[PDB]
């Protein structure tokens, strides 16, 4: 199956004293593997998965140097953006940046991403070709001109098609015991009566990895979306994921309804019945 490496960066300004709160996290697929938190004592990029602890002190020195540089870029950006948008020094503002690479089942480059938001709104993003920019407004268009003149897209494309995919492959190999293992959903159904004529069936998927999954209901073999509720996939906290989908049915007609589960860890989709 496909894989990805992504880095997420958030800076939140602190009006009145000092630099922004900066938090960086890195993921391989749905697995967090590194973090940096400016409020933490170490001031180092820190490991969050056992397989990254294989990397030597040179790796940690490098990631720490680079992530501190990212924090300084965001500090400057918060000031620049306050100027572009004619905002006061009174309020807290947020910058978010995400970038990374997707590879296919053959671990070859599929797509790269580099996008930026100010106060939760799209600001500027690299297009799919990795050669030009989508700027949402005139402030971002000023950034686009600056980044065009400085050949930023070229630098990012080299990183995304090169370093990003090379280190993703390295991590996939080093962390193979977990990163290349799929955990199929563990499924069951629960039943509740709300009244003498209405029941709820809830189809559960637990303990799965990666997070991507599809859960659907059928009635007499036909897709059923009405009277259903599908919750957001949620982290268990042990590295796996959970999800459920429910349907409301006439009491006594439970037999008509079937839940269908698709996941990379299941060779064939699975069916459950009450």
């Amino acid at each position: 199956g496909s894989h990805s490496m992504r880095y997420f960066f958030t800076s939140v300004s602190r009006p009145g004293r000092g630099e922004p709160r900066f938090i960086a996290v890195g993921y391989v697929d749905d697995t967090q593997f590194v973090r940096f938190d400016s409020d933490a004592a170490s001031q180092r990029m820190e490991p969050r998965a056992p397989w990254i602890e294989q990397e030597g002190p040179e790796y940690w020195d490098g990631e720490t140097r680079k992530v501190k540089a990212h924090s300084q870029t965001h500090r400057v950006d918060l000031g620049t953006l306050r100027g572009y948008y004619n905002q006061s020094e009174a309020g807290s503002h947020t910058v978010q940046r995400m970038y990374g690479c997707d590879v296919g089942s053959d671990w070859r480059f599929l797509r790269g991403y580099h996008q930026y938001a100010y106060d939760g709104k799209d600001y500027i993003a690299l297009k799919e070709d990795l050669r030009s920019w989508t700027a949402a407004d005139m402030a971002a268009q000023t950034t686009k001109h600056k980044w065009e003149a400085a050949h930023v897209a070229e630098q990012l494309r080299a990183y995304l098609e090169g370093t990003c995919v090379e280190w993703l492959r390295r991590y996939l190999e080093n962390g193979k015991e977990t990163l290349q293992r799929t955990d199929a959903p563990k499924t069951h159904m629960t039943h509740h009566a709300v009244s003498d004529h209405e029941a709820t069936l809830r189809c559960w998927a637990l303990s799965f990895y990666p997070a991507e999954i599809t859960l659907t209901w059928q009635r007499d073999g036909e897709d059923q979306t009405q009277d259903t509720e599908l919750v957001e996939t949620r982290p268990a906290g042990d590295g796996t994921f959970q999800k459920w989908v429910a349907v409301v049915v006439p009491s006594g007609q439970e037999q008509r309804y079937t839940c269908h589960v698709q996941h990379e860890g299941l060779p064939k989709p699975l069916t459950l019945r009450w």
Partner: peptide, 9 residues
């Protein structure tokens, strides 16, 4: 492995 430059807006 993170990018070695971070570009200001």
């Amino acid at each position: 492995c993170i990018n070695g430059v971070c570009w200001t807006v």
